[PDB]
């Protein structure tokens, strides 16, 4: 249970953006996505001990409505040096995996 | 005529190459009055609007803009080169050198195929792409 999934969650929607250029995109994702709608949190998963970008990052959006337009207008949009691929965030943690296992037997 | 836009100096040429971000920039280096350039430019004019979606065509006069002759070896009648996001893309035509075309082809369809293949490869991330035809032989029988 990493203590790093408790910064974006304000009942907001997290878009998981994979296929990111490793050399860049430390904050260029935030620079690109700040235009819509306002200041937000956009992190990049850069593994420690190597400083090498693992690829995927996450972006937190206030509304599902703004998220729809953001996805439809940034899916494949040229960011940094690579086009980005957008999907929904999973955050399959314990409090939800227990419920999933409980539902399985039912 | 050559209603295709013309670039008049090296700064204009490099600005043109850097302007596009998601479309292949095709550049024809040569003299507009050379017959080889005449035919090649006719083909480019024919396909320009068809390939407007993902390509932009430009014509460069060797004498007007000679500063690129040494680096790119522009010394044939007409040459065609492709760029994508400031990266000179190479094509494995089978002619021996993959840097340029250096001859005036006459089929707008193969020209469109070449540009489409270059776009596909460059977007995928390659610096060299393989033509869907081998121009080692003229295929005349």
């Amino acid at each position: 249970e990493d203590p790093s999934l408790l910064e974006w969650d304000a009942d907001d929607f997290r878009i998981f953006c994979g296929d990111l250029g490793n050399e860049v995109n430390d904050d260029i994702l935030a620079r690109a996505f700040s235009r819509f709608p306002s200041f937000l949190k956009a992190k990049v998963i850069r593994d420690k001990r190597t400083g090498k970008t693992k690829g995927y990052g996450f972006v937190s959006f206030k509304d599902p409505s703004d998220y729809v337009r953001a996805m439809r207008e940034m899916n494949g949009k040229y960011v940094g040096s690579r086009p980005i691929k957008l999907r929904k965030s999973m955050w399959k943690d314990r409090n939800l995996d227990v419920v999933r296992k409980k539902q399985k037997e039912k | 005529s050559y209603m295709l836009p013309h670039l008049h100096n090296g700064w204009q040429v490099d600005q043109a190459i850097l302007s596009e971000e998601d479309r292949v920039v095709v550049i024809r280096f040569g003299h507009d009055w050379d017959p080889t350039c005449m035919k090649m430019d006719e083909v480019l004019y024919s396909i320009a609007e068809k390939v407007k979606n993902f390509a932009v065509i430009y014509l460069v006069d060797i004498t007007e803009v000679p500063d690129f002759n040494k680096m790119y070896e522009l010394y044939d009648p007409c040459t065609v080169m492709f760029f994508f996001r400031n990266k000179h893309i190479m094509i494995d035509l089978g002619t021996g050198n993959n840097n340029k075309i250096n001859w005036a082809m006459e089929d707008k369809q193969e020209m469109v195929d070449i540009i489409e293949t270059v776009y596909r490869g460059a977007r995928k991330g390659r610096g060299l792409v393989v033509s869907p035809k081998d121009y080692s032989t003229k295929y005349r029988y």
Binding site: - | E73, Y75, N99
Partner: protein
């Protein structure tokens, strides 16, 4: 800016295609060499140019140039008025 500011880089095949890699004295030397080449050429220049001129004249006699053919229609085209000039339809019809 020359064209290197693009951050580009050229390519070379064959060590035959042009370049290799110009002061007062070099200017004088180049003038000398140009004079030498012109003087050597002067042998048959007059006859060669005369033959070229006569041959092109006869060829044009036998088959004129395109703008020469269209000169008459161009002259008559001169007549038309500016009012008609901007009223020309378009093939869209």
């Amino acid at each position: 800016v020359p064209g290197l500011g693009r951050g580009a880089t050229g390519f070379t095949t064959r060590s035959d295609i042009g370049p290799a890699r110009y002061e007062k004295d070099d200017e004088e030397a180049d003038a000398i060499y140009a004079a030498l080449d012109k003087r050597m050429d002067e042998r048959r220049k007059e006859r060669r140019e005369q033959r070229e001129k006569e041959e092109i004249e006869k060829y044009r006699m036998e088959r004129p140039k395109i703008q020469q053919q269209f000169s008459d229609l161009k002259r008559k085209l001169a007549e038309v008025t500016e009012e008609e000039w901007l009223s020309i339809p378009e093939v869209g019809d």
